[PDB]
């Protein structure tokens, strides 16, 4: 079973906000966009400036494999956790996320040479992260929590789409000071603007095959390559061979 998740997003924010106050004669107070009382020395303004732009792209692919007999129900289930580590790296705070998946199936052989299956799929990221800074979100990709149950039949060795989801969105906003926002040379100083775009695609594809012949090369014969190539191999110890001999082969 193949599961694919793709994500893209673009963000920009840019502009200013103004507020302030003036006291005249100590007898008339004037204030501009303040939701609060003022200390009346006056002649006090603030311009809050923001300017940021960002782009993000993420992609995740996962493919479980499970062997079963005809008419026999079978279950596969697997959790996994991932960590990320942050500057100040001596300090004891890893951010982490947990992804998990399970599949329960019941296969049937049709006379037509077709495989019919009853399916449950449950998959996704856990609902309750505790990310406080963005670092965890920019490091580790969110995916939904998704549940499907259905029946499907597929010609032998072909493949099929059981479910999928797509989402697209856009947003725009602008603020301005009614008279100044249109001044010819400085109007742009009195404006605020923001834009958001998002696109998401998620899909589930199934692809069954009949298994007639065992593995070639032998499992052990492959393992022996892996171990040596990795240097994990330690069968050289004169001390361990004394017993490894009983396990490694007849």
């Amino acid at each position: 079973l193949w599961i694919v998740d793709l994500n893209k997003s673009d963000l920009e924010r840019l502009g200013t906000s103004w507020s302030g106050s003036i006291t005249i004669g100590d007898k008339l107070g004037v204030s501009l966009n303040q939701s609060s009382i003022s200390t009346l020395d006056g002649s006090r303004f603030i311009a809050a400036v923001n300017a940021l732009e960002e782009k993000k792209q993420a992609t995740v692919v996962s493919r479980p494999v499970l062997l079963t007999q005809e008419n026999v129900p079978a279950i596969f289930d697997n959790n996994r956790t991932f960590y990320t580590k942050l500057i100040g790296e001596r300090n004891v705070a890893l951010e982490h996320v947990t992804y998990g998946t399970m599949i329960r199936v019941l296969p049937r052989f049709s006379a037509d040479g077709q495989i019919e299956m009853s399916l449950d799929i449950e998959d996704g990221n856990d609902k309750t992260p505790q990310s406080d800074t963005t670092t965890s979100v920019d490091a580790l990709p969110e995916v939904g929590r998704t549940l499907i149950s259905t029946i499907a039949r597929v010609p032998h060795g072909k493949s099929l789409l059981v479910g999928g989801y797509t989402r697209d969105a856009n947003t725009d906003t602008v603020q301005s000071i009614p008279f100044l926002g249109k001044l010819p040379l400085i109007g742009s100083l009195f404006r605020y603007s923001s834009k958001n775009k998002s696109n998401v695609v998620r899909v589930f594809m199934i692809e069954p095959k009949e298994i007639v012949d065992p593995l070639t090369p032998d499992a052990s014969e492959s393992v022996n390559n892996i171990l040596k190539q990795s240097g994990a191999w330690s069968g050289d110890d004169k001390l361990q061979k004394w017993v490894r001999v009983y396990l490694d082969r007849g």
């Binding site: 289930d77 998990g100 998946t101 399970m102 449950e122 309750t128 505790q130 406080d132 929590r145």
Partner: protein, 79 residues
């Protein structure tokens, strides 16, 4: 795979998803305060956070118990 949750679990989860971030705010506060204990700006903040945490945990527990006893009293009458 995913946890079965009852009803009491839903009640507890309302608090857990109510205080979005307090669970970690408290820890960060402690870390920096412990780094420099003699700063009254750190102290004044940590006092607030710790108090909010205390109230949150207390209310959560007391609530769960009340629902437990309502259910128990209804179930008893089946016999």
């Amino acid at each position: 795979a995913t946890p079965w949750s009852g009803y009491l679990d839903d009640v507890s989860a309302k608090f857990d998803t109510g205080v979005d971030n307090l669970q970690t705010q408290v820890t960060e506060a402690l870390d920096k305060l412990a780094a420099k204990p003699s700063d009254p700006a750190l102290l004044a903040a940590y006092q607030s956070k710790l108090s909010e945490y205390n109230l949150y945990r207390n209310a959560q527990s007391n609530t769960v118990k009340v629902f437990k006893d309502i259910d128990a009293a209804i179930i008893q009458n089946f016999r």
